[PDB]
Scaffold this active site. Structure first.
Site, PDB file in Angstrom:
ATOM      1  N   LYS A  84     -15.073  54.131  66.607  1.00  0.00           N
ATOM      2  CA  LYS A  84     -14.005  52.985  66.609  1.00  0.00           C
ATOM      3  C   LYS A  84     -12.550  53.601  67.409  1.00  0.00           C
ATOM      4  O   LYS A  84     -12.564  54.783  67.571  1.00  0.00           O
ATOM      5  CB  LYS A  84     -13.504  52.463  65.170  1.00  0.00           C
ATOM      6  CG  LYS A  84     -14.930  51.988  64.466  1.00  0.00           C
ATOM      7  CD  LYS A  84     -14.729  51.509  63.195  1.00  0.00           C
ATOM      8  CE  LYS A  84     -14.336  52.731  62.378  1.00  0.00           C
ATOM      9  NZ  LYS A  84     -15.580  53.626  62.284  1.00  0.00           N
ATOM     10  N   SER A 135     -10.006  63.193  59.716  1.00  0.00           N
ATOM     11  CA  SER A 135      -9.499  61.905  59.931  1.00  0.00           C
ATOM     12  C   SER A 135      -8.355  61.489  59.197  1.00  0.00           C
ATOM     13  O   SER A 135      -7.264  61.797  59.626  1.00  0.00           O
ATOM     14  CB  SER A 135     -10.846  60.943  59.552  1.00  0.00           C
ATOM     15  OG  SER A 135     -10.398  59.527  59.872  1.00  0.00           O
ATOM     16  N   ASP A 176      -4.521  56.498  62.399  1.00  0.00           N
ATOM     17  CA  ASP A 176      -5.080  57.689  61.356  1.00  0.00           C
ATOM     18  C   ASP A 176      -5.255  59.103  62.385  1.00  0.00           C
ATOM     19  O   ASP A 176      -4.764  59.074  63.445  1.00  0.00           O
ATOM     20  CB  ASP A 176      -6.248  57.441  60.601  1.00  0.00           C
ATOM     21  CG  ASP A 176      -7.469  57.222  61.465  1.00  0.00           C
ATOM     22  OD1 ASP A 176      -7.520  57.016  62.679  1.00  0.00           O
ATOM     23  OD2 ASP A 176      -8.682  57.763  60.905  1.00  0.00           O
ATOM     24  N   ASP A 236      -7.088  60.905  63.467  1.00  0.00           N
ATOM     25  CA  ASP A 236      -8.084  61.304  64.671  1.00  0.00           C
ATOM     26  C   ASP A 236      -8.089  59.896  65.542  1.00  0.00           C
ATOM     27  O   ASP A 236      -9.059  59.948  66.472  1.00  0.00           O
ATOM     28  CB  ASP A 236      -9.277  61.588  64.144  1.00  0.00           C
ATOM     29  CG  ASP A 236     -10.169  60.471  63.359  1.00  0.00           C
ATOM     30  OD1 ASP A 236      -9.304  59.968  62.347  1.00  0.00           O
ATOM     31  OD2 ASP A 236     -11.462  60.442  63.097  1.00  0.00           O
ATOM     32  N   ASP A 270      -9.274  56.814  65.150  1.00  0.00           N
ATOM     33  CA  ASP A 270     -10.178  55.686  65.121  1.00  0.00           C
ATOM     34  C   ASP A 270      -9.669  54.426  64.260  1.00  0.00           C
ATOM     35  O   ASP A 270     -10.157  53.276  64.373  1.00  0.00           O
ATOM     36  CB  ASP A 270     -11.687  56.101  64.803  1.00  0.00           C
ATOM     37  CG  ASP A 270     -11.304  56.871  63.342  1.00  0.00           C
ATOM     38  OD1 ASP A 270     -10.494  57.055  62.893  1.00  0.00           O
ATOM     39  OD2 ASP A 270     -12.609  57.243  63.122  1.00  0.00           O
ATOM     40  N   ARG A 271      -8.769  54.703  63.284  1.00  0.00           N
ATOM     41  CA  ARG A 271      -8.315  53.507  62.551  1.00  0.00           C
ATOM     42  C   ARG A 271      -6.912  53.054  63.206  1.00  0.00           C
ATOM     43  O   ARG A 271      -6.107  53.506  63.747  1.00  0.00           O
ATOM     44  CB  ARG A 271      -8.089  53.917  61.033  1.00  0.00           C
ATOM     45  CG  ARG A 271      -9.360  53.919  60.180  1.00  0.00           C
ATOM     46  CD  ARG A 271      -9.608  55.138  59.412  1.00  0.00           C
ATOM     47  NE  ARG A 271      -8.864  55.186  58.033  1.00  0.00           N
ATOM     48  CZ  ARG A 271      -9.365  55.209  56.805  1.00  0.00           C
ATOM     49  NH1 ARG A 271     -10.726  54.919  56.479  1.00  0.00           N
ATOM     50  NH2 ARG A 271      -8.612  55.221  55.721  1.00  0.00           N
TER      51      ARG A 271
HETATM   52 CO   LIG Z   1     -10.461  58.327  61.269  1.00  0.00          CO
END
Ligand SMILES: [Co+2]
Length: 557
Positions: free
Chosen positions: A389, A117, A288, A290, A292-293
């Site tokens: 997410k 992440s 981020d 990966d 998802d943020r």
């Molecule tokens: Co992430």
């Protein structure tokens, strides 16, 4: 014509996946002979042998150093164990929301996501291995426990040492294993396609194309922080939706993420903030490693905190065709986030679930058709379109809202606070505190607020007076799996809708302050100024400086 060889190995002891996958230093996966082999085999050993031939696993990651080496390992063990097929993104690249998309699209049994992440990537960086299951979301504790249990006793794995996957070329590669009738199959698929196709169906790409093009366009800059979402940006926002090329920033994934933390916030994305501050662009965002943020920025670098962001999305949610078609089954947010979402949900008669931090609670409500939109306090926004997410999805939701509202990002927030009131929010992080004292602090606080007459007791700062309504250690009884999660954080809830929340995670203390103002005169002030009365109150009642020696948080958000 590849063979199957079983290799005796030594079981490691620290291979616990947790809710985010095994994360260790890269040099640990490298210097430790068979670290990865053992854990992959433990994952695959949780899958019933009677189902492996017909099963597909989705495999990809964020591009960080050691990823492809690990992917090749995964296929050599998948194949040797009778898993029928891997679906791998080109060059091994699949964002975390892409993995969730594909698993659900093709009814795979699950997936292995090679990512840490937001943790730094590189030779001297981190590596993580995440396992997802057939609903497309993170594997739950019951599978997590089995894995680590298997990992600690691992005596041998099965591998195809001579098996080599060509991750760069599209299409189907097949492998005739020694003494197996059925071939082992690897499809290399385009990294963005299935995910773009899903976004194409969720949003109005026609409307977005009009927003982002022509000399009338919304000027945007999107910072993928040298991580996985790079090509997603370039193919979707630039190529398909016609945003100009300069919109894509750091959208070439690097194995070291350019040397920085692929972590979206105002310090780690201070490049993107510099740009936005120059006053040329209407909208900025960072992701981020990966995907998802996400952090959202307005013109001149106006900062939209995650808790307000999900609240704005919620209040304009029908700008998005998906929600027009599916309706909104409910709203959720983790307990430590601000209550801005709550205010939107209270005005619509749509339910709000306040869950502890962590995905399982959101996924449970999603699979029960009770949760449409959710946030986490760490720059997470998502929906039931997948079971992770999804940062780029959140960006496209904002752009949709911008296109229909036709206002600047700041003007949208200002109107939102004018209507729902403002939840001034900040989070104080106290890192590497003496775990002894911090635990004493927490226990002394929990005992203080479990006194009989602790409710009602007022507190004053600048003549501003706060009266405590409730005080507890948050617990949540999950409506789906019956789980009960206790000690999820100490809550000081005030009769004006303000809150103080303490959590632990040496130790690290997290202090969340949520102060609510309805007055338009107080609506547009510096948060740190408006939050100061409750910050002082929090530090006094906890006596944090006394229990830790810290005169100041390490980090403010
Ligand atoms: Co992430």
């Amino acid at each position: 014509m590849v063979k199957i060889v079983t290799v005796k190995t030594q079981a490691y002891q620290d291979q616990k996946p947790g809710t985010s996958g095994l994360r260790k230093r890269v040099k640990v996966f490298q210097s430790s002979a068979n670290y990865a082999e053992n854990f992959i085999q433990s994952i695959i050993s949780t899958v019933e042998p009677a189902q492996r031939q017909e099963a597909t696993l989705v495999v990809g990651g964020d591009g960080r150093f050691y990823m492809k080496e690990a992917i090749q390992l995964i296929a050599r063990i998948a194949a040797a164990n009778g898993i029928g097929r891997l679906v791998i993104g080109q060059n091994g690249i699949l964002s975390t929301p892409a993995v969730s998309c594909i698993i659900r699209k093709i009814k795979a049994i699950g997936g292995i996501i090679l990512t840490a992440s937001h943790n730094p990537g590189g030779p001297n960086g981190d590596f993580g291995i995440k396992f997802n299951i057939s609903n497309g979301g993170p594997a739950p504790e019951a599978i997590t426990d089995k894995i680590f249990q298997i990992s600690k006793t691992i005596e041998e794995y099965a591998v195809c040492p001579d098996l080599k996957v060509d991750l760069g070329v599209l299409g189907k590669q097949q492998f005739d294993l020694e003494n197996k009738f059925k071939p082992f199959t690897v499809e290399i698929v385009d990294s963005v396609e299935a995910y773009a196709t899903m976004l194409r169906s969720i949003f109005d790409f026609s409307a977005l194309k009009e927003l982002l093009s022509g000399p009338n366009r919304l000027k945007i800059r999107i910072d993928a922080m040298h991580g996985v979402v790079g090509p997603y940006v370039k193919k979707i926002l630039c190529e398909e939706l016609g945003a100009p090329a300069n919109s894509a920033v750091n959208c070439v994934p690097l194995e070291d993420f350019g040397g920085h933390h692929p972590d979206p916030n105002l310090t780690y994305a201070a490049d993107l903030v510099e740009t936005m501050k120059s006053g040329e662009h209407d909208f900025g965002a960072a992701f981020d490693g990966d995907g998802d943020r996400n952090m959202i920025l307005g013109k001149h670098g106006f900062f939209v905190n995650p808790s307000d962001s999900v609240a704005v999305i919620a209040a304009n949610i029908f700008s998005i065709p998906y929600f027009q078609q599916t309706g909104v089954r409910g709203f959720a947010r983790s307990m430590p986030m601000s209550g801005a979402l709550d205010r939107v949900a209270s005005a619509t008669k749509i339910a709000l679930y306040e869950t502890p931090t962590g995905w399982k609670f959101f996924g449970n409500l999603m699979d029960a058709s009770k949760l449409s939109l959710c946030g986490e306090e760490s720059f997470g926004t998502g929906s039931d379109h997948i079971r992770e997410k999804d940062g780029l999805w959140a960006v496209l939701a904002w752009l949709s809202i911008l296109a229909t509202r036709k206002q600047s990002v700041e003007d949208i927030l200002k109107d939102h606070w004018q209507k729902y009131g403002r939840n001034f929010f900040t989070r104080y992080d106290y890192e590497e505190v003496e775990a002894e004292g911090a635990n004493k602090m927490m226990k002394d606080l929990e005992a203080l607020m479990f006194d009989r007459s602790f409710v009602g007791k007022q507190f004053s700062a600048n003549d501003k007076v706060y009266t405590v309504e409730k005080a507890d250690n948050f617990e949540y009884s999950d409506p789906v799996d019956g789980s009960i999660s206790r000690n999820q954080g100490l809550r000081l809830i005030f009769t004006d809708g303000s809150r103080i929340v303490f959590r632990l995670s040496g130790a690290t203390i997290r202090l969340y302050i949520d102060s609510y103002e309805k007055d338009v005169a107080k609506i547009n002030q510096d948060p740190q100024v408006m939050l100061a009365p409750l910050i002082s109150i929090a530090l006094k009642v906890s006596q944090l400086q006394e229990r830790t020696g810290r005169t100041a948080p390490t980090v403010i958000t």
